[PDB]
Amino acid sequence: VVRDEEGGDYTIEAGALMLADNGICCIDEFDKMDISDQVAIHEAMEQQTISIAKAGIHATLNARTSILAAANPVGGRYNRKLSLRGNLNMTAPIMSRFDLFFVILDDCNEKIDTELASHIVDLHMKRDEAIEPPFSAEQLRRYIKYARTFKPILTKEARSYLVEKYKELRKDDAQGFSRSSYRITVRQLESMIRLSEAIARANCVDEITPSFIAEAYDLLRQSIIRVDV
């Protein structure tokens, strides 16, 4: 909120999340946010709306956004001995908000880095335009906008497999330890449902097959495989 000194504005200014409505917000260096944003975010994502009441003006703004963030592990390099919570300084309630995690590591293997350097050089000088993706960007956008017009449903066996998978996921993680491991809530089930719907959309199918449920469970489990490794 901003106002000109002794000027009757009382107008709000839009942040990046406000501008990213119905789109994707891409935040870099997620680690060094401050308290106000750090406590506003975990309301921004889950509720899709932001509310404020300061100096006589109150409003409720829409924040329908899809967030994508990057982070750097504390100490520079990821410590494989510890877990995600140990290495990262970002808080637990923010962790539950996210649906997927990806950790990518560098190494000193002589085979990999030579290929990396060669691939960088090839696109730099030899084939700066001659890269070979299976599909063109226009075809990708055509397929994306065609698949976006599908709304899948759920079938009986899908529901049974889903409830069995949720029971298993709640059981096996809670069997580890108490007061040290808390990661599975109803939000995980909702995220699994959303991922199943997205995968069903990708194949342009109006129904959902338990194989999609299996793939979603595999992704979520590999999120917890990654924290263990």
Binding site: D106, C108, E110, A117, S118, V121, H124, M125
Partner: protein, 130 residues
């Protein structure tokens, strides 16, 4: 994220202090003109050099070489100083080394100059250990 970095450390010695004293006193007691500016403009406008396959092998060998120094006879997993930023820095330095002298393609001299000028600062980048 800087491309390069340089350090200056004035330390009191007899010889260098004497040399600076003589030099500055003589100043107290081969240079071109805007020709430089027009040459720079011509190089920026009309010269678009590219790297060649010959220098690619040298680039890869230099990358491996600084990767080779990044580990030793101990399993401590020494600091990985051979970042991809080093690769992009070498590439840009080499391309700029082809930019002047009005050349159109790179030679070896470009890549050895780039690696020498990039590792001279790294050799002075160490802390008190090693």
């Amino acid at each position: 994220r800087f491309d390069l970095v340089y350090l200056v450390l004035d330390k009191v010695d007899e010889k260098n202090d004497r040399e600076l004293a003589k030099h500055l006193t003589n100043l107290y007691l081969v240079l071109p003109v805007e020709f430089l500016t027009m040459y720079i403009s011509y190089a920026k406008e009309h010269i678009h050099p590219i790297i060649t396959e010959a220098a690619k092998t040298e680039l890869v060998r230099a990358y491996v070489g600084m990767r080779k120094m990044g580990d030793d006879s101990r399993s401590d997993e020494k600091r990985i100083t051979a970042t991809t930023r080093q690769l992009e820095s070498m590439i840009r330095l080499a391309e700029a080394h082809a930019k002047m002298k009005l050349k159109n393609v790179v030679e070896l001299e470009d890549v050895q100059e780039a690696v020498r000028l990039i590792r001279s600062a790294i050799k002075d980048y160490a802390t008190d250990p090693k």
